[PDB]
Amino acid sequence: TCPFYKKIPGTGFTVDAFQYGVVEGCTAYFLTHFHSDHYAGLSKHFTFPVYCSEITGNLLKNKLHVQEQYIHPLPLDTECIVNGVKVVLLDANHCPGAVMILFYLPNGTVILHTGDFRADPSMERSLLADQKVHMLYLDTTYCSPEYTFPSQQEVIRFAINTAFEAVTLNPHALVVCGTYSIGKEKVFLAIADVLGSKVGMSQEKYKTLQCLNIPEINSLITTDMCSSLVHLLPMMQINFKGLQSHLKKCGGKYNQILAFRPTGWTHSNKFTRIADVIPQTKGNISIYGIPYSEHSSYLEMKRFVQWLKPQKIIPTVNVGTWKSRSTMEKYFREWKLEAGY
Ligand SMILES: C=CCNC(=O)c1nc(N[C@@H](C)C(=O)NO)c2ccccc2n1
Ligand SMILES: [Zn+2]
Ligand SMILES: [Zn+2]
């Protein structure tokens, strides 16, 4: 059934709860962002109100074919009333259209649901600065101190420099970026921009990017593969076998592939700083795993929570084992004692 951390107490609201059938007493279903583990269950047959960002709403309409009458997009940073409850959507710094939701409950309690987020100091200057938060539903994906990775900007700097050098040294090299969902678009957009090329992709991926309100997107992306020297492929094809096969389809136009696998955190990232990252190479194909994260590092998560000073924290990730739940509560306790709330 629907887990407790997906229900907002004192309301008829659920968050990211689309795979449990009709949730008893739910009058509005919130969707934090368009990632399959969150929209799972939504389809053209859904007949309840869905509240979300404009971008998420574009994807619901065009990709899942949810009926327009059930899509309720809300602007960011704006007090809105939904079923008699004041709510605000805030940028989650996750993927395009991803939001955190602030609920102002009728009894005076204030709840922040982060959805998925990458905590950032800029969030300390949103509407969050203005009032106390009694409950925090926290994206705890990387809630352990071993989860370190660089900033997104540092990872992009590495990717741009690596691609620019390779193509400047060999104008016949092809750059390939793997993708499986929305998010992490900056990897391929920044590489294509430095190389003066558009990004070539399948019709399905092109359709998805057309829903993202990305400025000047028609100048950046294309389905014309051969006119482009940065190609997007499904993540599962970013291996030597899949890349060798892709190189044949190009028709003697390229003699080298440099490929990027933007992963999340990897244990290798503790040893090797972003500047020391080296690829796996087989012949004329090199594959760079790069730690581009759209979730908070441990340090980013700790800073955000210690600033927010919530009275109670409900984790939404890694909640499956006694060990994982215990470890997270121990960190919350440490953060609270250190900061004094
Ligand atoms: C290792 C931690 C990172 N996060 C997940 O474990 C995760 N991420 C997903 N997609 C990403 C894009 C996302 O951010 N979604 O919200 C999944 C999609 C389908 C099934 C399981 C999924 N697990
Ligand atoms: Zn996500
Ligand atoms: Zn997720």
Numbering used by the authors: 700 to 1040
Show sentences the authors wrote:
Interestingly introduction of an extra carbonyl group at position 2′ (as in amide 20), resulted in a 100-fold decrease in potency when compared to 13, while against SNM1B and SNM1C inhibitors 13 and 20 show inhibition with a similar range. As was the case for the initial ELF hit compound soaking, crystals were back-soaked to remove malonate ions with or without 500 μM ZnCl2 to obtain the mono- and di-metal forms suitable for soaking different classes of inhibitors. We obtained structures for SNM1A complexed with three derivatives of 6 (13, 20, and 19) at resolutions ranging from 1.5 to 1.8 Å. All of these compounds bind to SNM1A with very similar orientations. Their quinazoline ring is positioned to stack with D736, in an equivalent position to the adenine moiety in the SNM1B nucleotide complex. The hydroxamate group binds to both metal ions with its carbonyl oxygen coordinating with M1 and with its hydroxyl group bridging M1 and M2, the latter likely in a manner similar to the nucleophilic water. A hydrogen bond is formed between one of the carboxylate oxygens and D736 and the nitrogen of the hydroxamate moiety with all three compounds. The R1 methyl group of the inhibitors is directed towards the side chains of H734 and S880. The binding modes of the R2 substituents are more diverse, but all of them occupy a similar position close to K883, Y841 and G963. These three residues form the binding pocket of the 5′ phosphate of the substrate, which has been shown to be a key determinant of DNA binding and exonuclease activity for SNM1B.26 With all three inhibitors, the R2 groups are positioned in an equivalent position to the ribose ring of the nucleotide in the SNM1B nucleotide complex, but do not extend into the phosphate binding pocket itself.
